Design a protein around this ligand. Sequence first.
Ligand SMILES: CC(C)Cc1c2c(nc(-c3ccccc3)c1-c1nnn[nH]1)CCCCC2
Length: 133
Amino acid sequence: HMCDAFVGTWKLVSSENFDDYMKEVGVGFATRKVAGMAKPNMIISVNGDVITIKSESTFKNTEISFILGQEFDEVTADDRKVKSTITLDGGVLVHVQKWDGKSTTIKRKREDDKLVVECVMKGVTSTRVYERA
Ligand SMILES: CC(C)Cc1c2c(nc(-c3ccccc3)c1-c1nnn[nH]1)CCCCC2
């Protein structure tokens, strides 16, 4: 029941500062423009200990399946090849991605009827809010 309140289909409704976050991550112009337009659905499910987070959109489709605390390989929507570890900390999914000597942290939390995704790279944060589909 660890992630019960995250499970579902969630549609992006707002994004703040995503362009500056993407710049900090190293995403190039064209990818920033196309990624910034899209309105993905994030689909979260749990089967035993395995959590799956998918995104479906007009830009990219992504899928990660993982066990909390167990590092895995991920191909991000912007085509970084990263090493990811996701844990639960105080009810928040905390996802660290490591690549090329760099790191970014993505937090996913349930707040009211939303799923809030906060992405941080160095001093730059972006907030993306998703609602039930
Ligand atoms: C929010 C982040 C944790 C995951 C993420 C990333 C990127 N693009 C997207 C994305 C996917 C589909 C449609 C539009 C944009 C998404 C994402 N947004 N919702 N799901 N996936 C590329 C830019 C760097 C950060 C990684």
